[PDB]
Design a protein around this nucleic acid. Structure first.
Ligand SMILES: [Mg+2]
Lengths: 215, 225
RNA sequence: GACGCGACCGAAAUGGUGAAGGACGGGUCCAGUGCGAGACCCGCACUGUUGAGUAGAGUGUGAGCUCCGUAACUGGUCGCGUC
């Protein structure tokens, strides 16, 4: 049987200076043949720990690993700003090698409500026969947020796609865009297009809308 | 001084073939194990293949066995991944990595290349259309306005977006692309600015999609009413 | 008692022989670990507990031992010969 490496949690939120622990649980003995890596967005992984508990040369000692039978943990004794990243365990006891699913370690800060903007489709795009309506949620925390599209007050489903940025290096917030896609024919048979946002930092849902053809 | 550089990536259709190469410098591959590891967009690392020194033994992930072949040309100090019968699920950034010296770092992978993107799809190369996201005639949501550019229907990844040839960077958010059901990508780039300058300050998004020879600039302004 | 001759015994050694399996070893087989720029292959080292088929998974005329012989001798015993 290929060896499973079950990594938890899949994400965690922590303040700078906090102690955190990440766990990887092997599905059979892997002796001590376990490594941990760090990966930042857009960049290659970097080795932190080898042989389960040995510190790789040049890695700061606030990183440590330990083995307890077939459970393995990566501990950071006190997070620094540059430690927020995704971490992967790996077993190399036998082939095929196995990576854990990864743990994203994000910065915890105070709640921030998003500012919301809606953008109608441009006249240029409409010439092409499709309309895209965009809703922007700017600089919010935490990441959980709900966007609902309404077309003449009817709730849309299955015709929108969302994208979230990485947590901001300066203010530690996220931003989100949601794009509603309609044919030109369907777009022109309705008037009121609306984006409805719920976020922890909002007492009540906030709605932004426009009327097709008016300013 | 140790570096790995992969090349050979790009677009290929389902069932097609592609050879990746991994050029070592600062060490000689004959003394090390060399591994290939891939990462699908948004997902985790998945080990692909490796080749052992002195014996040349090779090992493969079940999900690629029989289709992929790892090899090494010591006289070019280069490793290779020959990929055959490619499927859409093989779309990924492919990294090569050096397994370090046993006495120094166990079986850890101590050096990694920066990766090369392999896209397996039947969609054909296409430049994007770039549409304005115009600042609202109302005004603001908190003293400031928002505007941007919609970069729609290109293939393959990546594209770059900048504002005012790089002069404008504060409050810019360029979102990761999404893959549409058409098989084409789309993304938007937005920036928040003071509403009081919408009429006097100039705002231009710069889009570059090298695979299609498409490079455009879009001035983004308010509208009639 | 000395010497001599012989026989028997003993005997370093030795030719043949055939049982014993990990408590005789192995440059026998295997497993686990470490090392050599080395997860496997190759070499070396360590560790193994029913490691583990007794003569072969062995292209050892291996050690010890069983059984059948042979035997240096500068060992013993008995007989005989001469003082
Ligand atoms: Mg987007």
């Amino acid at each position: 049987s290929d060896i499973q490496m079950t990594q938890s949690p899949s994400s965690l939120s922590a303040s700078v200076g906090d102690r955190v622990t990440i766990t990887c649980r092997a599905s059979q003995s892997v002796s001590s043949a376990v490594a941990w890596y760090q990966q930042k967005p857009g960049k290659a992984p970097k080795l932190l720990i080898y042989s389960a508990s040995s510190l790789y040369s040049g890695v700061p000692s606030r990183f440590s690993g330990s083995r307890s039978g077939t459970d393995f943990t990566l501990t950071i004794s006190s997070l620094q700003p540059e430690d927020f990243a995704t971490y992967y365990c790996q077993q190399s006891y036998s082939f095929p090698s196995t990576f854990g699913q990864g743990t994203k370690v994000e910065i915890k800060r105070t709640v921030a409500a998003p500012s919301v903007f809606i953008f109608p489709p441009s006249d240029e795009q409409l010439k092409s026969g499709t309309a895209s309506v965009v809703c922007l949620l700017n600089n919010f925390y935490p990441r959980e947020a709900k966007v609902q599209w309404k077309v003449d007050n009817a709730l849309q489903s299955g015709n929108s796609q969302e994208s979230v940025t990485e947590q901001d290096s300066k203010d530690s917030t996220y931003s989100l865009s949601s794009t509603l896609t309609l044919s030109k024919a369907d777009y022109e048979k309705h008037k009121v297009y609306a984006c409805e946002v719920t976020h922890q930092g909002l007492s009540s849902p906030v709605t932004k809308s426009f009327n097709r053809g008016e300013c | 001084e140790v570096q790995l550089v992969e090349s050979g990536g790009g677009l290929v259709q389902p069932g097609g073939s592609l050879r990746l190469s991994c050029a070592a410098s600062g060490f000689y591959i004959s003394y090390s194990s060399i591994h290939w590891v891939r990462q699908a967009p948004g997902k985790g690392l998945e080990w692909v293949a490796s080749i052992s020194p002195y014996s040349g033994s090779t090992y493969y992930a079940d999900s690629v066995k029989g289709r992929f072949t790892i090899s090494a040309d010591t006289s070019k100090n280069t490793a290779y991944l020959q990929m055959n019968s490619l499927r859409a699920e093989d779309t990924a950034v492919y990294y090569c990595a050096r397994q370090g010296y046993r006495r120094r770092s166990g079986r850890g992978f101590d050096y990694w290349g920066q990766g090369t993107l392999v896209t397996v799809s039947s969609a054909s190369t296409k430049g994007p259309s770039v549409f304005p996201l115009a600042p609202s005639s109302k005004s603001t949501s908190g003293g400031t306005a928002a505007l941007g550019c919609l970069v729609k229907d290109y293939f393959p990844e990546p594209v770059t977006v900048s504002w005012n040839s790089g002069a404008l960077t504060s409050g810019v958010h360029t979102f990761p692309a999404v893959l549409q059901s058409s098989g084409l990508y789309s993304l938007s780039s937005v920036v928040t600015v003071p509403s009081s300058s919408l009429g006097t300050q100039t705002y231009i998004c710069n889009v570059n999609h090298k695979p299609s020879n498409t490079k455009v600039d879009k001035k983004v302004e308010p509208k009639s009413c």
